[PDB]
């Protein structure tokens with residue numbers, strides 16, 4: 001039986017379609033969502049979910065969370081380096097990637113790829129489903145933010161593979177929410193705007209939905225904007241206030257910083273229904289206490305630039321779809337951070353007073369849609385009609401002379417899709433031709449994101465310009481690129497090497513074996 005898993009920055013959620021309805025499956029503590037946390041105790045036990053989150057403040061250096069903020073990224077990504085300040089666990093460079101180092105007991109250190117931490121969370125979600133169903137689960141539909149790039153998508157698929165899941169399909173979070181909203185609606189064509197603000201990533205998608213046919217027309221997002229940033233703004237405010245008032249810098253005391261996290265998260269949630277919240281920490285730093293009152297006004301002020309920046313993707317989507325505000329028929333809010341009154345206010349005011357769709361739990365709707373998609377793809381006949389057209393989030397291009405982004409596949413193209421181009425050599429007997437592929441909307445490649453460097457190898461000896469090598473760039477239904485090459489000369493095997501350094505089957509097998517030790 002195939003399940004849907006929403007693998008989220010702060011929480012994850014698992015659903016199954018069975019007997020004609022979605023069940024959101026409760027974990028072994030009775031909770032319909034599970035924290036995306038993993039911890040290693042001094043005694044050598046591994047904890048996942050609620051139990052891991054519960055001991056953050058007593059064992060901060062060996063409690064891992066927010067792995068989705070690191071997954072599929074390089075070490076020098078500014079989103080990685082900015083986030084290190086607020087994470088209690090050591091982040092070390094390895095394979096040009098941010099790895100996570102922890103103590104597993106007896107002095108002993110272990111280093112993990114972000115994929116391996118996310119695999120442990122997926123395994124706990126799988127086990128939650130297996131307990132409910134009373135049998136093994138080997139197949140799943142797993143979520144990603146719509147604006148996740150090629151590397152982030154592949155790394156999430158690899159986490160699935162490490163967790164013993166055949167990932168049937170990667171689904172974009174707002175698309176999943178749209179399915180939850182729109183399955184079995186027979187209203188004819190409606191324009192639906194999904195505003196998806198979770199713990200770590202932000203997406204906006206505009207879909208048409210018409211009697212079981214769903215199409216993403218335009219999407220735009222920010223993969224490093226979410227609830228964790230709102231917390232960290234408030235945390236930094238108090239870390240600096242403490243140093244100003246006392247002289248003492250607490251940024252290296254991990255217990256101090258993560259006790260502040262715990263209190264800030266609590267206060268933030270309270271401030272969605274109250275106007276003031278009390279922050280209290282006993283033995284915050286060097287045996288001293290910390291008490292501060294946080295008003296809703298101050299919380300809003302500390303985050304207002306980030307809140308107002310959520311309108312940037314909304315306008316980008318309206319521009320790309322050539323629609324006006326008045327053409328939007330329904331606004332669907334998902335992600336837990338859409339509970340923030342100021343966020344609701346900003347969206348409502350942007351659409352001239354339009355109220356959001358009712359009956360949608362912003363914590364669960366993404367998993368609900370993923371579970372529907374799993375059931376449909378399995379061959380269920382008691383599911384609602386579902387035909388889905390989804391898109392690539394980023395323009396792919398190739399670097400040409402002058403550091404120029406030459407466009408190959410535009411953003412918002414329905415996937416799967418492909419494009420071919422003929423390449424040749426610049427020098428006599430040249431054996432290798434290198435192609436650099438970028439992701440982004442800027443005219444120069446230095447302002448876009450490098451996807452990969454691909455080498456066409458084994459070009460047979462000939463005079464410059466004579467070889468004719470057709471290279472095909474295909475984005476599959478998961479949004480992941482595959483590059484292949486064929487010799488179109490008159491009367492050779494052309495192999496492509498790349499610098500992406502994906503996890504190999506050998507490496508994955510080692511990671512599966514290492515996870516079995518706990």
Ligand SMILES: Nc1ncnc2c1ncn2[C@@H]1O[C@H](COP(=O)(O)OP(=O)(O)O)[C@@H](O)[C@H]1O
Nearest residue numbers: 008009010011198199227269272335336337339
């Ligand atoms: N009532 C609330 N007020 C403010 N923020 C909330 C509220 N409920 C949940 N959140 C935030 O939403 C995020 C949780 O989003 P959710 O969709 O449940 O999981 P994920 O963050 O993994 O997407 C967290 O950052 C959390 O602080």
